[PDB]
Structure formats: structure tokens, C-alpha cells
Amino acid sequence: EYLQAMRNFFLDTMYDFYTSIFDQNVSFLNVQLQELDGLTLSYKVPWPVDIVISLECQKIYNQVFLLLLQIKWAKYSLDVLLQIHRMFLLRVKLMHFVNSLHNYIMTRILHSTGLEFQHQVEEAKDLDQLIKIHYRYLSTIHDRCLLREKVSFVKEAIMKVLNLALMFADGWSIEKMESDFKNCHMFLVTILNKAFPHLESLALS
Amino acid sequence: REIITLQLGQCGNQIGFEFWKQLCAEHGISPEGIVEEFATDRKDVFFYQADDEHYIPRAVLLDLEPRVIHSILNSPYAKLYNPENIYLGNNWASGFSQGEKIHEDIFDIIDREADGSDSLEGFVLCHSIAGGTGSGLGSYLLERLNDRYPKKLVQTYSVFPNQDEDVVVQPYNSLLTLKRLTQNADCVVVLDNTALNRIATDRLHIQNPSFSQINQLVSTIMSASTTTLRYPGYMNNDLIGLIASLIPTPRLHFLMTGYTPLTTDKTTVLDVMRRLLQPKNVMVSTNHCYIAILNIIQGEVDPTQVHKSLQRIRERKLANFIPWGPASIQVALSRKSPYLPSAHRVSGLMMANHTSISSLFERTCRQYDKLRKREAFLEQFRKEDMFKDNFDEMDTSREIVQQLIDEYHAATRPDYISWG
Amino acid sequence: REIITLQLGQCGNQIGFEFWKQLCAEHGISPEGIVEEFATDRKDVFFYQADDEHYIPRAVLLDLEPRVIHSILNSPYAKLYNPENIYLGNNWASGFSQGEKIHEDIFDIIDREADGSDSLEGFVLCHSIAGGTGSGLGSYLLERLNDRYPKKLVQTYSVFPNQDEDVVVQPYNSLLTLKRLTQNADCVVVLDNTALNRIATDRLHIQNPSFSQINQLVSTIMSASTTTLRYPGYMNNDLIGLIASLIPTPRLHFLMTGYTPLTTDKTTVLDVMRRLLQPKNVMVSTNHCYIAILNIIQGEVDPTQVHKSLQRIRERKLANFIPWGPASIQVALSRKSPYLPSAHRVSGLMMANHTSISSLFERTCRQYDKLRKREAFLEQFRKEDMFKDNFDEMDTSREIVQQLIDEYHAATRPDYISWG
Amino acid sequence: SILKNQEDTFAAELHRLKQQPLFSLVDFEQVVDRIRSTVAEHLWKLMVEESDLLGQLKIIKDFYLLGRGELFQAFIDTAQHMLKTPPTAVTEHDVNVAFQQSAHKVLLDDDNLLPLLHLTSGWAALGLSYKVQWPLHILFTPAVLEKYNVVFKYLLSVRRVQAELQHCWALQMQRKHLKSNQTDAIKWRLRNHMAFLVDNLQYYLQVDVLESQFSQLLHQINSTRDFESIRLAHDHFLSNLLAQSFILLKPVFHCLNEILDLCHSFCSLVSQNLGPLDERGAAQLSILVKGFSRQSSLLFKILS
């Protein structure tokens, strides 16, 4: 129950939590809760589950929470509107891509292995192997949502395309965006074409 | 957020009653308002949380010269809603003028309900185009709602009057209503009478009692359209996030809907995707091409199969649309509801922007122009007369719908950098 | 690859209905379109794979002034096909002129079906030569099909009108049709009315209801001709690979067929090979000699016995043909179909190019010339008149069929280095 | 197994042999033979029924002896770019991608991760490796699947050249219809037919050669119920296939390869020429008729 609830308390409900932060005080957010880069996170761990759930597990979990916050930030920020028509077309060009990316990170990873993992932890017979299957869940979800290494070819690309989402949000000059976007998009596909191979799921899009 | 429903027109009040009855059956609600004994799921958008957890439907019924409202009155489901939200000629201008003089108290009722709600997201409209009394008054209320609330959303569910003829003045009324719908509404859900009638005559063997079945059809469609909000997942649990993908441009805001089982009372998702792309599962009628397609699935789904299905259907190229740009299909998932027996539990919905409805509009543009040219079909109605002695509002709407058809046909072209 | 069927003429639509009914019975298909409960085998050539795995037959029915189509309409097998592919004088020139004015929409239907198909291989034609309405319009459509699609194959199944007389103008019509068949078709499957009639009067004791039986005969023959494609082996699972062996030269493209059981409701393959080389098992009527012979076997076969049978029949010299060159018999094997009760499960087919049909053509060449010489049998038909006021197209076809008979008789000679 | 049940009896006999003073080979032989029957029978009992050995043999026939000609025709229909030299860095992945994509059109929505295509031309480097259940079968080895790959390549060659030839026949479609077609310069003695015969007859011959051995194996296995005998039958099946398809190095195999090379070169001549035209086609045609006339006589040595 704790394990399922933990990843429901970060990684719906938290969308409302982030929309308040979209528009300081850390105690304000708690009260708003109870009824893009950086943030602090905190939640108490009780002792009988603290002998299985690690403190460093919260860190790994927190990193992908920050990434997801950037994703929802991009989704909501380009969702601020519904010749000068020219901006519309730059809307569809960008708002699609971050959506498609959001479809891949979320469902294909955080729901596939996530739905599998509960069925795995209900089959453990011991306290010890329960830790091992848990850490061997953590280390692979930390690789699928890539944060370890080769991150100088992928995560900088995701950051630099998110800077376009900053630029368009201010912009609501224009010509200098597509020149960058087609280029870094081609970087993404030309690297991710043969380069673990699950990255092909966005190389065809 | 929190959405208030408005219902007007005879068929609109029919489908509103059926929709609320369907949601009371769907959720753990008794027809008295009481929570069921066996009731996790959200009812905090369309149902006020009252004193005995009474999920009182957030609905405002608007009517004039009531007939079917009396049949609503003597019902066990007349205790689910009506906390006194009920307030008591077939011309557009008649209903416009009548709504004009009583705009204040009904707007007061709207403000009362807005005060009663803690948050607000949208006013969803149950409408019947050229339904007589619903026409004109519905356009008037739509204009008033857009005026008073520039921060809220307007969704319109309506049927388009085509029964292959009847009324010689209804294309004028529907044209004025369409002019109002284009300018004073944010997103429009379009329905066709003859198409749903043909499907009803198809899967069943009825010819007259089509209303009683079409109520079920629209109720199922509308509830399916809201299921991911009513049954919380985490993809697009807001209206605005869902609507943002569906509208590619503020000039094209009409949405085509389907329903994967024509009758559902164990196929895989791959099959019913192929079924849904067949037009016999589509319930709304050069090349006509979609701009953007979305689908929503609710059933017993394996999460790997949807990926490989998207692969195979992508490679098969059963998506007969050619866009002008980068827009593609979008997938979504929802929960199968409890307490309802469903054989072949996989059920899907589609929301797509398709240009073909322009031709349907063109049919009316042809008809109205024909009756304008012969000029024996305006019939000299008096409400139409003092409202507009020169009848240039019809010319204004003709101008707008011509611009609309041209925008449609410019969107058909592989560039939209040129306009129409 | 994927083959579309076209059916026209009263007997052609009869055998098309019987053929589709036979394949629905043969495969695991219900007469609603639904796959059977007990259904490995390929249905991906003549059956579109629809939404509920509905093997919808890839067929286009062409007709004018429908009579038998109404009898097709009221049938349980009117729900297997007809996804609206049905579109509503006995002169060649009449049907030619009528097909001329409506060439566009039927060609649009053809292009629609070509777009509906992913791949394409051929248009197989159900035809009745000098069937009245089928004549002329069939030649017109054959010319149109050869024009529009220079990359596809054309196969023609047709019967040759001989009943030993009736119509005094039909040899003219069949001669023009034969001229079109020689030039505008890629391969022709020839059938004789009197021969099949004689076999029907032979094995049974009928005299009138020959149509109902001959439908079965042609259906069995055509399905047998396609079985190795419908039931996948690996020898000649394409049409083109099969047709390439059968045609030795583009001037001789008429194929003689048989059927090893005259009635099949435990002999070995050696016996039925000897039976098939007897002409009583052959269903189409100096020395006449085959150019190239092929046979297809489906049954309970031992693979060593076919080799020794070929040895013994080769040594017995029951192949009474003398070629001009190196061409010989070819063997092929197919699968016996399930779900069909068959006593004496061994069943074979033959495809051979034989010169004897020239004599049959010569019979018509004699007849038409006779009626041309007396000149009391053209009858002055008006369609024939404004189509050709001088009637030199009949002379043109006479020229072509004379060249054809001369090509036949040059092929009879032990050198084809000389022509005729 | 029933070896555990009858374990103590074989142990009692072995202890009896331990008890005996005299060493006799005859008795020891009988004990070993008595054990061996049951020991082979249990593996036979499991492998036929529960590991579905026959069902896998169907797939082996389908994909190695090309018993499913439908997929390996459309595979060539949608891929013709391993006629040019592979870099073996991009094409290697691409051919397997194209294979499964072609398969997806109809038939096999379950596995087809078990076949693996590897490029070590590209039709002279394309191999196939089928993944088998290694704990559940010891009849299959690396070497057995390697020999399967060998006959797979040899069968690929003939269908490859034949498909090009039969597809190039568009005489009756385009070239003759609506066209008079000049002759006695643009004649070719109808050698399209002559080239077609010697390969199509070979196709029929190979049909019989494969199908006979596959019938014999599937008959033999049901009769015997010991794994040793199954091993004999399988190791006979392969040996017949090799020699009868002339995979053993004989001069006949070289002749057959020369015929295939001639057909492959002939396709290149007729492809570019298209309908009636002179492009100094007679120069290659003279070489072709000389080579074919010379090569046909070697088959008259194979005939005698």
C-alpha cells in the first residue's frame, strides 16, 4: 500500500499541485495540496517500511519527478491559447512533439514497468529479495528514463528543445525558432536511429 | 474544473434527462440523491456535494411553454436534480425576442449557480439546431454567456437538422444559429439526425421510435467523452487540456465522433482500431482529410499491444487523411465503469477534425440560397420582420458561412499558409 | 497478388454467385461474412479483410436492365458481398454504346476498388459470349481495362455460344467479341456450351435444367484453377508464374480444361492420369496436337508413385500430341480442401493448349461468311448502323480471325519458324 | 520419467553383478541394454507430446526448406537492395526489419523473434538462425541449424533468379498489345521460354526432393518410441537432403551454378532493353546463346 501510494504522491492530483506553482513560500504549497529547474521535496518514511525503502530511492524518484514537472510545464505553457496566424503553425509544430514525448516517457515506461512491479513484489517470499527486486527496479527505470550517462547527447537535447518552449511562451524573432528546431530534431533522429534500443520509439516520430 | 450543464430544446432536455439518469446509474447514486449502499471515483464536476452526500446534478434547465418538462416532473428521477433550476412559436427571432426580455432572471439563476459552485470551468450546452423554440433563444443565451464570462469555456452538443425533408424557414434559422455558433462558441460537437437515424434503422429494425434510442446513443457518447474526468486517470483530467489538442485552429472547432461497438450487448484493441477507422463505426457523415485524430479506449487492454497495434496500423496506412503539416493520431486510455454488465469489454471513442461536414454545410448553403433566390419561402414572419426589416442578418450569416467553407477548403490544401 | 473479379452477363453473374457461394462454403466463412466457429489458409486475394475479419469478396458486378440481380438480392448470401458494388437490347453495338456513355462512373468504381486494394494483380472476367447484353459492353470494358491498366493481368472465363441453333446475328457479335478478346486480353479460358450440355446429359439424365448444373461445373473448375493460390503450397502461388508456362506465344492464349471425376460423389494417380488423357474427361471440344500440357493434382498422393506414373505414361505414349519443339507436360500438386466430404479424394485438373478449338472457330467463320454472302441475316440493326455505316469492323474481325486460324495452322506444323 | 520408479530394480541387478564372482560380458551387456530402453523412452515420451517437437518441425520446414513460399516471395518483392554490396552496419538490421514488416501483412502476429537474419553480395551473405528451446531439445545443435542455413541459401538462389525472370515477362502485357513489334533484328528466338524451362523444371524437381524426405521423417518418428532411433532418422534425413539437392561438391553442382549465373546475367540484358529497341543487345545475346548451348550439353553428361 505504501509502495503504490508513494509513486502516487509524486509521479490528476499533482497537476493541480503544479498549476499553483506555475503562477516564495514552501508552507503555502502544503496547504494548497492538502485540500522549471530546481525544487525541494520531502516526505516522511515510517520505520517498518524504512527497512526496505531506501532514502536514496527518494532521490532517484525525485529526479524523474523534476523531469515530469518540466514536461507538464511545457504542456501547460503552450496550452495558453486556443499574417499573425503564423504563430499557430509553430504551435502545432511544437505542442505535438512534447506531447508525443510525454506519451512515451509516461505510459510506455512509468506504467509498463510500474504495473509489472506490483505483480513482482506480490510474489516475493522474503524480506531480503524484496530489496533486491526493488533496487533492480530502480536502476533500470533510472536507465529507461535516461539520467545516468550518454546524457550529453540526449538530456541536453531535451533541455534545448524546452528552451524553445520558454521562448514561445514569452513570444505569445519567430523565424529563428524553426531553424533551430529542425536542426536539433535531426540531431535527435540521427543519433537515436541505431542507439537501450527503446529510444527508437521516438526516433520514428 | 467544475462544469455546469445547460439544457434547452425538447431533444436537448430529453438527452439531458437520459444523461443524468445514465450517470446516476453509472455512479453509486440512488434516484433519490442518496449514495448507494455499495459505494474512489470523482463526482466533483457535475454533481454538487450536498448535505447527505447528495450528488445533486449541476444542471440548469431552460424552457418556455413546457410540455416534456411535465413528463420530467412525474418521475422518480425528479428527486435527483431540480433544486429549483427549472424555469417555465417555432421561429429563431421569436425565441430570440422572448429570451431578450427575460435575460435578466435567467442570468441571475446562472450567477446564483456560479456562486453556488466553488470553482468553474465551463458551460456545456444541450442544444437542438432549428428545434423551433430552442433556435434563437439558444443563440441568444450563447451570445450572453460569451459576453458575461470571457474566462470560461463553452462546449456545445447539438444535432444538425437533416431528415431529407418539412419546414421551409429552418435553413434560415439554422444558418443564423450556425453564425452564432461560429463566433460565440469555443468548441462545437456536431451531430447529424439522418446519420444516427440510419444507424438506428441499421442495427435494429425500428422506423418511428428513434428518439428513445438516439437518447441512449448521445448519452453513451457524451459520458464516454467525459469518462477520464469522471473516472480519474491522469491524462487530460481537465477539459481544457483535452480540447487544446482537438482544436488545431480557432476556425475549425467542429468535432467528429464515433463509437466502436454499434452493439455491445473478446476482440483485441487491434481489431477495433481497424473497425473504428471504418466509417460504419463513424456516426457523423476531391479528398476529405482529417486534420487531427484522437482516440480514447476503455476496456481490458494489454499495454504492449497498443504500441504494436499503432505500429501495424501506421504501416497499413488505414488513416486516409492527408494533412498540411505535422498533425497525427493521439491515443488515450480510460477506465471501464463498474456495476454495468459489458460483453466485449473493450470500447473506444474517436474525436477527429474532418473536413467532410463542410459538404453537409454546403448542402444547407445551397438550399437556403435556393429558397432565397425564388423568395417564396421566407414566408414573411413578423418576428423576423421587426427584428430585421431588411433581413440583412441572413446575408451576414451567409457571408460568415461562406468564409467558413473557404477556410475549410483552404485547410484541405497541403498548405494553410495560404488562407481561404 | 491481389485479384479483383468482374462479373457481367446473366450466366456470368450466375457462375459468379455460385463461385462466391462455393468459396464461402469452402473456406471457414459464414454467409453473413463472419468467420466460422471452427476456423492456416489464404483468403487474401479475393476477400477483403474487413472489420470483424469479414472476408468481403473482391467483386464488381456490372449489369444493365437487371432481372437475375433481384434474385441475388433476396438471399442469405446477399450479406456476404455487395458493399455496394452492384450497378444497374441484345446487340453487341447496343451494349457497346450503352457502356460508352456510362464508362466514367463504372471506371470510377474500378478505381475506387483499386484504391481499396493494397496490391493488385489482375481482373478476372466472368463473361458470356453473345449473351445479348453481355456482348459489346464486355468487349468495351475489356478494351477500357487494357487501356487504363497496362501493368495488370486480364483473365477471361467465358463460354462459347454453340447449341446447334436461333439468333441469326450472334456469329457477327461473337466474331467482334473474339476480335476484342484476341487483342485486348492477356489470357482466355474457353468453354463450350454444347460440350458441357452433352456431359450434363451424359452423367445425369437432365435435358432442361442445365444451367443449375453447369454453374457447379464451372465453379468447381475455376476454384480448382485457383486452389494452389487459395490453399498455399509453394509452386506457382502467383497467377503470373502459372500463366507464364501455359502461354507459349502471345497469339495462342486459349486454354483447354478438364476435370478428372465426372462424378466424385480409391483409385491411384496412375489411373486418373490415364483417365484424364481420355477425351471423355476433357470438357472442351489432319492431326490436332497440344503445344503444352499442365496438370494439377489434389488428393491423397504418394510422392514416389507420381514419378513412376510419369515414367509409365511417358513410355505408353498416351500423349497424342506432336509439337514443333521442346515443350512437354508439367505436373503440379495442390491440397484437398477440408470440410467437404469427398469419396475418391484424388481429383485433378488439366490446362493444355490445343489446336482443335480452331476448328470450332472455323465453324463460326464458315457460318458468318455464309450469312454474310447471302446477306439476309445482318437484319439491319440500327445500333450496328450508326456505330458503323459500312460494317467494315466485321471485315476487320474477319481479317483478324483469319490470321488467327492461320497462326493456329502454322503452329500445327513441326516448325513455327515459318508463320501463318 | 519412470526411471526413478524402476531405479531400484536396475540397482538390484547392478548389486547382483557386484555380488557375482565371475566377470561375464554377456550379463553386463543385458543389464545395460535393459536400462537403455526405458532411458530413451522417457525422453521420447516427453519430447513428442509436451515440447511439441512436430509443431516446431513444421516451422523448420516452412522457413528453412521454404515450405512457405508466400513470405519469401514478398520479401524479395519489397527488398532488392542486397544485390549491392552491404556495408554490414546498417543493412544487417534493415533486412530483419523488412522481413518481419513484410510478414505482418497477413499471418504471424505471434512470435518471429526466433528467426534471426544475419548478413556476414547480400544475397550471398544472408543467413538465417532459428532459436530453439535448448534445455528441451538436444537433437538440435549449432551444426544442424548450420546445415539448415546452407540449404536455405541454396534454395534462395533459384527463387531469386526465377522471380526476376518471370517478372520481366511483360511481353503479353505491354510489348505485344497495341504494338506491331519489328522482327528479324529484334527477334531473340523466344529464348525467354528456353531460359525459363531449365529453371522451372528444376523448381518442380526440388519440390519432389524436399517433400519426399519430409514425408518420410514425419512417418518414421511416430512408429519408433526411443530417442536413439529418432536420432538415426533425423541424421539420415539431413544426409539425403544434402546429396539429393547436389550440395555435395560434384561437377554437376558447378554446372547448376553456371546455369544460375547465366539466368542472372540474362535478366540484366532484358531489363534495360525494354520494348522494341537496339542497344547493341546482340553482343551479349551472342555470348548468352553460346554459353547456354555449351552448358546444355553438360546436362547431357549428367543425363548419361
SS (H, E, C) chain D: CCCCCCHHHHHHHHHHHHHCCCCCHHHHHHHHHHHHHHHHHHHHHHHHHCCCHHHHHHHHHHHCCCCCCCHHHHHHHCCCCCCCCCCCCCHHHHHHHHHHHHHCCCCCCCCCCCEEEEECCCCCCEEEEECCCCCCCCCCCHHHHHHHHHHHHHHHHHHHHHHHHHHHCCHHHHHCCCCCCCCCCCCCCCHHHHHHHHHHHHHHHHHHHHHHHHHHHHHHHHHCCCHHHHHHHHHHHHHHHHHHCCCCCCHHHHHHHHHHHHHHHHHHHHHHCCCCCCCCHHHHHHHHHHHHHHHHHHHHHHHC
Q: Are D192 and C248 in contact (CB under 8 A)?
A: no
- Please state, in angstroms and rounded to a whole number, the distance separating the CA atoms of residues A169 and D41: 75
Q: Are C125 and C156 in contact (CB under 8 A)?
A: yes
Chain B's closest residue to A114, CA to CA, is: B303
- Please state, in angstroms and rounded to a whole number, the distance separating the CA atoms of residues B220 and B59: 18
Angle, CA of A122, A123 and A129, to the nearest 5° = 105
CA distances from B319 to A202, B276, B291, B316, B362 (A): 20, 11, 11, 8, 25
Residue whose cell numbers read 428521477: B77
Chain C's closest residue to D178, CA to CA, is: C183
The helix, strand and coil proportions of chain B, stated in percent and rounded to the nearest 5, come to 45, 15, 40
- Please state, in angstroms and rounded to a whole number, the distance separating the CA atoms of residues C327 and C312: 19
- Please state, in angstroms and rounded to a whole number, the distance separating the CA atoms of residues C406 and C412: 10
- Please state, in angstroms and rounded to a whole number, the distance separating the CA atoms of residues B35 and B24: 10
Subunit contact C153:D173, Cβ cutoff 8 A: yes
Q: C378: Cβ–Cβ under 8 A, 6 or more apart, which residues?
A: C169, C172, C371, C372, C384, C391
Q: Are B299 and B378 in contact (CB under 8 A)?
A: no
- Closest among B179, B199, B136, B131 to B159, alpha carbons compared: B131
Subunit contact A92:B326, Cβ cutoff 8 A: yes
Checking D227-233 for CB contacts under 8 A at 24+ apart, the result is: D227/D40, D227/D41, D227/D43, D227/D44, D227/D47, D227/D139, D228/D36, D228/D40, D229/D40, D230/D44, D230/D139, D231/D139
| Cell output for D207 | 519440390
For B16, the enclosing helix (H) or strand (E) is helix B10-26
Count of positions (residues) in chain A: 205
Chain D's closest residue to B270, CA to CA, is: D109
Q: What is the resolution of this structure in A?
A: 5.3
- Closest among D251, D263, D266, D73 to D155, alpha carbons compared: D73
Q: Are C289 and C355 in contact (CB under 8 A)?
A: yes
- Please state, in angstroms and rounded to a whole number, the distance separating the CA atoms of residues B201 and C165: 51
- B244 has a chain A CB within 8 A of its CB: yes
- Please state, in angstroms and rounded to a whole number, the distance separating the CA atoms of residues B200 and B193: 11
- B146 has a chain A CB within 8 A of its CB: no
CA distances from D199 to A39, B345, C240, D295 (A): 74, 55, 16, 13
Is residue C60 helix, strand or coil? strand
Q: Are B189 and B155 in contact (CB under 8 A)?
A: yes
- Closest among C99, C123, C119 to C110, alpha carbons compared: C123
Residue whose cell numbers read 547431357: D300
CB nearest B331 (choices: A83, A86, A103)? A103
- Please state, in angstroms and rounded to a whole number, the distance separating the CA atoms of residues A99 and A112: 18
The helix, strand and coil proportions of chain C, stated in percent and rounded to the nearest 5, come to 45, 15, 40
Residue whose cell numbers read 498416351: C318
| Cell output for C348 | 485433378
How buried is B189 (Cβ within 10 angstroms: 0-12 exposed, 13-18 middle, 19+ buried)?
buried
Fill in the DSSP letter of residue C378. S
Q: Decide the pairing of beta strands B254-257 and B347-354.
A: antiparallel
- Please state, in angstroms and rounded to a whole number, the distance separating the CA atoms of residues B228 and B212: 26
Fill in the DSSP letter of residue B122. E
**Which residues in chain D have their CB less than 8 angstroms from residue B312's CB?**
104
Q: How many CB atoms lie within 10 A of CB C278?
A: 10
- Closest among B354, B355, B336 to B346, alpha carbons compared: B336
Exposed e or buried b per residue across D29-40, where buried means at least 16 C-beta atoms within 10 angstroms of its C-beta: eeeeeebeebbb
Largest CA distance in chain D: 101
Q: Are B329 and B295 in contact (CB under 8 A)?
A: yes
- Please state, in angstroms and rounded to a whole number, the distance separating the CA atoms of residues A196 and A194: 9
Q: Do chains D and C touch (3 or more CB pairs under 8 A)?
A: yes
Q: Are C255 and C190 in contact (CB under 8 A)?
A: yes
The DSSP bridge partners found for residue B67 are none
| Cell output for B210 | 428513434
Amino acid C109 reads I
SS (H, E, C) chain A: CHHHHHHHHCCCCHHHHHHHHHCCCHHHHHHHHHCCCCCCCCCCCCHHHHCCCCHHHHHHHHHHHHHHHHHHHHHHHHCCCCCCCHHHHHHHHHHHHHHHHHHHHHCCCCCHHHHHHHHHHCCCCCHHHHHHHHHHHHHHHHHHCCCCCCCCCCHHHHHHHHHHHHHHHHHCCCHHHHHHHHHHHHHHHHHHCCCCHHHHHHHCC
Q: D119: Cβ–Cβ under 8 A, 6 or more apart, which residues?
A: D82, D86, D88, D91, D92, D95, D125, D126, D127
Q: Per the annotation, does B134 bind a ligand?
A: yes
- Please state, in angstroms and rounded to a whole number, the distance separating the CA atoms of residues B394 and B179: 9
Chain A's closest residue to B243, CA to CA, is: A82
Subunit contact B241:A79, Cβ cutoff 8 A: yes
Interface of C with D in 189-218 (CB under 8 A): none
Q: Are C235 and C38 in contact (CB under 8 A)?
A: no
DSSP string, C75-126: SGGGTTS-SS-EE----HHHHHHHHHHTHHHHHHHHHHHHHHSSS--EEEEE
Q: Are B296 and B333 in contact (CB under 8 A)?
A: yes
Which one of D177, D192, D197, D270 would you mutate to disrupt binding with C, by most C Cβ within 10 Å of its Cβ?
D177
Q: Per the annotation, does C134 bind a ligand?
A: yes
H helix intervals, B58-119? 68-73, 92-101, 103-116
Please count the CA atoms within 13 angstroms of the CA of C169 that sit on its side-chain side.
17
Residue whose cell numbers read 527477334: D187
Subunit contact D69:C237, Cβ cutoff 8 A: yes
- Closest among D134, D124, D36 to D84, alpha carbons compared: D124
Task: For residue D146, give how far its alpha carbon lies from the nearest alpha carbon of chain B (Å).
Answer: 32
Residue whose cell numbers read 508456362: C245
The DSSP bridge partners found for residue C192 are C160
- Please state, in angstroms and rounded to a whole number, the distance separating the CA atoms of residues D282 and D264: 17
Q: Are C253 and C184 in contact (CB under 8 A)?
A: no
Angle, CA of C137, C19 and C32, to the nearest 5° = 110
Is residue B163 helix, strand or coil? coil
CA distances from A55 to A58, A67, A126, A134 (A): 6, 20, 21, 13
| Cell output for D238 | 539431413
Q: What is the CA radius of gyration of chain D?
A: 27
How buried is A67 (Cβ within 10 angstroms: 0-12 exposed, 13-18 middle, 19+ buried)?
middle
Q: Do chains B and C touch (3 or more CB pairs under 8 A)?
A: yes
Q: What is the CA radius of gyration of chain C?
A: 22
Subunit contact D173:C183, Cβ cutoff 8 A: no
Amino acid D236 reads H
What is the number of CB-based contacts under 8 A between chain A and chain B?
52
- Please state, in angstroms and rounded to a whole number, the distance separating the CA atoms of residues A145 and A137: 12
Strand ranges inside B283-358, DSSP E: 290-298, 329-334, 347-354
Q: Do chains C and A touch (3 or more CB pairs under 8 A)?
A: no
**Which residues in chain B have their CB less than 8 angstroms from residue D104's CB?**
312, 315
- Please state, in angstroms and rounded to a whole number, the distance separating the CA atoms of residues B284 and D246: 65
- Please state, in angstroms and rounded to a whole number, the distance separating the CA atoms of residues B408 and B376: 31
Q: Are B159 and B193 in contact (CB under 8 A)?
A: yes
Which one of B302, B305, B310, B312 would you mutate to disrupt binding with D, by most D Cβ within 10 Å of its Cβ?
B312
Amino acid D292 reads F
Please count the CA atoms within 13 angstroms of the CA of A142 that sit on its side-chain side.
16
Q: What is the CA radius of gyration of chain B?
A: 22
Angle, CA of C231, C232 and C235, to the nearest 5° = 125
Q: Gaps (C–N > 2.5 Å) in chain B: which residues precede them?
A: 39, 88, 165, 265, 285
Q: How many CB atoms lie within 10 A of CB B352?
A: 22
How buried is C365 (Cβ within 10 angstroms: 0-12 exposed, 13-18 middle, 19+ buried)?
buried
**Which residues in chain C have their CB less than 8 angstroms from residue D172's CB?**
186-187, 247, 250, 253
Chain C touching partners, 3 or more CB pairs below 8 A? B, D
How buried is C262 (Cβ within 10 angstroms: 0-12 exposed, 13-18 middle, 19+ buried)?
middle
Fill in the DSSP letter of residue B340. S
Q: B177: Cβ–Cβ under 8 A, 6 or more apart, which residues?
A: B92, B129, B130, B135, B136, B138, B139
Angle, CA of C346, C220 and C8, to the nearest 5° = 165
Subunit contact B186:A93, Cβ cutoff 8 A: no
Chain C's closest residue to D66, CA to CA, is: C234
- Please state, in angstroms and rounded to a whole number, the distance separating the CA atoms of residues D262 and D265: 5
